[PDB]
Design a protein around this ligand. Structure first.
Ligand SMILES: COCCOc1cnc2ccc([C@H](C)c3nnc4c(F)cc(-c5cc(C)no5)cn34)cc2c1
Length: 290
């Protein structure tokens, strides 16, 4: 049940634009197309546009419904070609709401670059990085901190447009291997993507997203290799503090590696902005043919 009185009164108008009438959405529960810790995702058809419908029923309780709606309202206002959009929220009598996302033909960026059937060039891979940078520039301009930027958490549509995903109501752990339980707080953290200061404080900033972006670039240029494989979970802080960074991949251009090292600057405030990353990467990208 939607209680409009409960919402911040300035957001009540926005509710009609986020909520999808059950009549307008058909969900195909017959086959699961995706799995998160919080629930499965299914094909869906919205009024005929193909969408990805995520259930949240694997969570015991959804939380404050007023907050869930507020999250949707905030998320639906985001619009950028390199950011996954929210089409809406559909309310079903039996169970939690369905999250309705655009269908992403080519799945997550990490699996796409790991796939033997596709053969992106070095230029293509740098271009995926640039697209991610533009999406993050947008999110950062909205004062939004992602907290979990990685190749696994970006997706590709049918035109190979890369969209930063896994945020707001689509937030989940979509590959459990890469999340380790903190011993004091119990938080499951993507430690191998995290900045030094975040490993220490568990506080995340746009500048810690910049660190994660550095890692994502490394993933692109290794076509999805796991970072720091011979390091175990929270021993990553000790490893980094020995004076270490991910090594330059064979086909990573030198200036792109220099960008990665700037993304991993020990002082968060000295890391480049996403605007700067877009600028520097666009230049590098422009030097390539094919
Ligand atoms: C090859 O892919 C087959 C098509 O299946 C789809 C298509 N579109 C989707 C759109 C969103 C989603 C969920 C809601 C989602 N939202 N953000 C992310 C995200 F950042 C990553 C993933 C993800 C990673 C992995 C591995 N499996 O799912 C799933 N995500 C799954 C889809 C599955």
């Amino acid at each position: 049940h939607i209680d409009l009185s409960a919402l911040n009164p300035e957001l009540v108008q926005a509710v009609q634009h986020v909520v999808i009438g059950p009549s307008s959405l058909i969900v195909h529960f017959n086959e699961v197309i995706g799995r998160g810790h919080f629930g499965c995702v299914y094909h869906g058809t919205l009024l005929k546009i193909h969408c990805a419908v995520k259930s949240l029923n694997r969570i015991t309780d959804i939380g404050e419904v007023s907050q869930f709606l507020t999250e949707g309202i905030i998320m639906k206002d985001f619009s950028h070609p390199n950011v996954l959009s929210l089409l809406g929220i559909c309310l079903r009598s039996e169970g939690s709401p369905l999250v309705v996302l655009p269908y992403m033909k080519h799945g997550d960026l990490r699996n796409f670059i790991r796939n033997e059937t596709h053969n992106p060039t070095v230029k293509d891979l740098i271009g995926f990085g640039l697209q991610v940078a533009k999406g993050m520039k947008y999110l950062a301009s909205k004062k939004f901190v992602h907290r979990d930027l990685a190749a696994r958490n970006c997706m590709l549509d049918e035109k190979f447009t890369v969209k930063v995903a896994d945020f707001g109501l689509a937030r989940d752990m979509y590959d459990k291997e890469y999340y380790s339980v903190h011993n004091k707080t119990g938080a499951k953290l993507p430690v191998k993507w995290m900045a030094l200061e975040s490993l220490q404080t568990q506080k995340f900033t746009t500048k810690s997203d910049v660190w994660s972006f550095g890692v994502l670039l490394w993933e692109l240029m290794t076509r999805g290799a796991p970072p720091y494989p011979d390091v175990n979970t929270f021993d990553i802080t000790v490893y980094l503090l020995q004076g270490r960074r991910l090594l330059q991949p064979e086909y990573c251009p030198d200036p792109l590696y220099e960008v990665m090292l700037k993304c991993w600057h020990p002082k968060a405030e000295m890391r480049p902005s996403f605007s700067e990353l877009v600028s520097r990467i666009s230049a590098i990208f422009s030097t390539f043919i094919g």
